[PDB]
């Protein structure tokens, strides 16, 4: 589990393996004191770059848990078709309700 | 089954036997790479012609599966009736709801 009061602890695997619901209360229950005798290897600005590589891979894991809720998203914009010679490519102005009962 | 990445395969018998419910998916799920080692005998413009009689004559098939649904086709206009010598030929504006429970 990552510790959010230390700069050199937050990795990509510590954020992705932790759940999105579990990411809320883990960061809210950290320590106010920031420690500064052993820093993150890419500096103080570089640790924020590494933290955001876990949340971007977490919605793709959240999309699997909600894959039994929505459909397969058909393309949004034209120029995307296999058969472009007898029909056009449509483009979804996605006003639909993606929901599976 | 007609292969949609070679134009030398589309005939009218192969598309009319295919329903229009399934022709939505078969067009978007094909291979993007157009092939050009087997051309068409009516030209490539004639291959589009052979595709669309395959769709138009298939519209009877999607309608015959819904033959327990709509009503009898009323004569839309005058001139379409047998006995003309005392009463006219009506024309029925087909603005109704064709639906049989």
């Amino acid at each position: 589990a990552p510790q959010f009061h230390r700069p050199s602890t937050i990795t990509a695997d510590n954020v992705r393996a932790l759940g999105t619901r579990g990411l809320v209360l883990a960061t809210n229950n950290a320590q106010f004191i920031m420690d500064n005798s052993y820093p993150h290897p890419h500096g103080t600005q570089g640790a924020v770059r590494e933290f955001l590589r876990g949340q971007a891979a977490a919605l793709t894991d959240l999309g699997v848990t909600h894959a039994n809720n929505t459909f397969a998203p058909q393309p949004m914009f034209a120029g995307d078709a296999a058969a472009e010679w007898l029909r056009p490519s449509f483009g979804l102005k996605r006003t639909y309700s993606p929901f599976v009962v | 089954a007609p292969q949609f990445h070679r134009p030398s395969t589309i005939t009218a018998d192969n598309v009319r036997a295919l329903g229009t419910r399934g022709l939505v998916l078969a067009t978007n799920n094909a291979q993007f790479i157009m092939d050009n080692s087997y051309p068409h005998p009516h030209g490539t413009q004639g291959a589009v012609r052979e595709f669309l009689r395959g769709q138009a004559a298939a519209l009877t098939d999607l309608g015959v599966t819904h033959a327990n649904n709509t009503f009898a086709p009323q004569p839309m206009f005058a001139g379409d009736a047998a006995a003309e010598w005392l009463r006219p030929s009506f024309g029925l504006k087909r603005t109704y709801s064709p639906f049989v429970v």
């Binding site: 007898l86 029909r87 | 012609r49 839309m76 206009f77 001139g79 379409d80």
Partner: protein, 49 residues
């Protein structure tokens, strides 16, 4: 175009004389009264359509 494709037509029409005049009213006049320059035609790929 007519209602009776059974009583078909190549030489003898179905429409009144003012019918195309009415279209000449509707196309040449009224649509420019709403256009302010912004409308244009289209040639149809009915095979694509």
């Amino acid at each position: 175009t007519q209602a009776r494709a059974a009583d078909a037509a190549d030489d003898r029409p179905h429409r009144p004389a003012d019918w195309t005049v009415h279209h000449k009213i509707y196309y040449y006049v009224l649509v420019p009264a709403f256009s302010r320059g912004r409308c244009c035609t289209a040639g149809v790929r009915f095979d694509r359509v």
